[PDB]
Design a protein around this ligand. Sequence first.
Ligand SMILES: [Br-]
Ligand SMILES: [K+]
Length: 733
Amino acid sequence: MAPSENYTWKNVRIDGGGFVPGIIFNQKEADLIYARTAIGGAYRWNSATSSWIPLLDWVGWDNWGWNGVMSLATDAADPNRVYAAVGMYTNTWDPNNGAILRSTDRGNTWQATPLPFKVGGNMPGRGMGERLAIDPNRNSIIYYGAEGGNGLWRSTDYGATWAKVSSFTNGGNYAQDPNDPNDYLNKIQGVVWVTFDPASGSAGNTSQVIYVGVADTQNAIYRSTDGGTTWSRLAGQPTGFLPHKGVYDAVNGVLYIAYSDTGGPYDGAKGDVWKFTASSGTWTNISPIPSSSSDLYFGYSGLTIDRKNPNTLMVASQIAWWPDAVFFRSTNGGASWTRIWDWTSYPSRSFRYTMDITEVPWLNFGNSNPVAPEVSPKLGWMNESVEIDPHNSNRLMYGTGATIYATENLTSWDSGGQILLKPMVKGLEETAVLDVVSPPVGAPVYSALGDIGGFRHDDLTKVPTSMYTTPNFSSTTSIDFAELQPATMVRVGNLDSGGGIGVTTNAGGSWWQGQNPPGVTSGGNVALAADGGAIVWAPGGSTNVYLSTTFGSTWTAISALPAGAVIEADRVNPNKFYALANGTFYVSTNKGASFSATVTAGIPAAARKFKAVYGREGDIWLAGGSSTTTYGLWRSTNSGASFTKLASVQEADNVTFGKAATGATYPAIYIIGKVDNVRGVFRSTNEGASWVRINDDQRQYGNFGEAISGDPRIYGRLYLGTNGRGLLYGDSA
Ligand SMILES: [Br-]
Ligand SMILES: [K+]
């Protein structure tokens, strides 16, 4: 067994960067707040440090889908208890079923009960909820609205065991696109929320009245009046739409429901907000703008009630992409509303809010000259979760596709003032890291991220001012620096429907955009010669890989390389480039103009990660494989002429190098992999002869390791990319 060494793991500070489909306040305990994410686990707010604490970093390599958090419930009767429904996809992309996780210590530790079906924390419909709900009068009882047509599920033993509720017989019939050939939009979204009437029981006794939301346009709302023994469609309900939210107020005895014509979170063209009064059975359409009006171009979600003053409620657009989201507020139970912005004289608007992003300045997306009617930063989008603090009428929080915004002066709206919104995402690190580099001079690390581009990180403790611009990719798929002239850098990535390339000669002080070769539909990957004098780019979509000798102004096709081959430059000899594709290794000795196959056997076809070593010409390490084929770590010391498998590694998925141990003759090597039957993150300081585990079972981060980098200046340091937990750095303790 590889021994473990004590390490300190932190996030490189970005603040947010991903979608928060759910914010959940505990109804009895003030400042107890959780957030659920689509791909990056769940978090608990720590009010003493003003930061979020991740709760699911123990999810590892084989159960990686558990970082998908489709619902979370926090127990009002016992605030130490918390539950989460987990799993990431309901198609083939997650090979595993979902689970309900249960905790008696606020998510410090958990136990899992696997479900007999999949959970879709990053599927369509994931902003509808909460599907998981605890009986507020009898906390042994929990319900889960399942996806897929599996219907309504229940535990009566504090989450330990779960079974289908036989008497609930509508599992839902809506998929966003039932004929999607991509097999992503075509899954039944199912039973979407469970909401109790707390006045229908008392501490210790089963709540008799329960409402359930179903993604069925003709049967959206069900009710039990006998503690879930029997269920019936609620009479007199509206039809034609899907209920994103169902929020019940026992003070006035009213169920509010926000509907949309799709499951969300990316779309929604029509919907309504309805009010059901339980005492009389009355239905009222309280839509700020009803779907019968041609002025309405979004559905509704973001439904929340002010628990301290329950005549006050809010709802929001699901979805207004243009000109921005709108939020609506009523203080008289929906009889009338005002809106957070208004047209004054088109394209100008008046606003009931201001926004301060000085703690997360990249949220303007590098745009400080937006064209009216747009502003920058925007109010938001994918704003399915909007929540008034049940202990403080002045606090509200909402999730977007990029952040959590919060206000602490919400009732200023009601006196004609402007609420202040600010990000509230310190510690909540949700980005997918696609590539990462650590040069030997200047800033310690550069990130290449999905959705927000990525950054030069001048200080790992300080949020970068802006993502890369000119060009500004949505996702940077690959970045490189010229080993011998590190201020020269290149990056490729995704831009409005296609791809492109950005180059720089002052280490990203400023970039400019190069021209494209034919057929580019996405960034793919790129390599920069060691002296900065050539670029080899394998774009997505293109039929070829291309060379530039003009720093991206012009290109020429490379005849031998398959489309999309993984390219790496030698870090010493500017004339050497390498490529890997599907079991074949290829080398160029003429600075990228041509390549030739050198190895066609012994390398697993699945391997797609390799790297040349700084300071060591022709020294290459290669990681990959699969459990059905062959798997491990290979090394060449002859510029790719041949590879030797390391006997010390059972499986490896990526490899990088950093500063040598004092006295050692070779850089430290870091891998993502399996060594002596243990999965994790390993360091070798003797050329791969033996390994030390530098992570631990609480710090596994799921499907991590697509991008890793050692640090040539700092012994022991590893920049560890994740898919949903940002960019970590680990240091020897
Ligand atoms: Br829109
Ligand atoms: K819309």
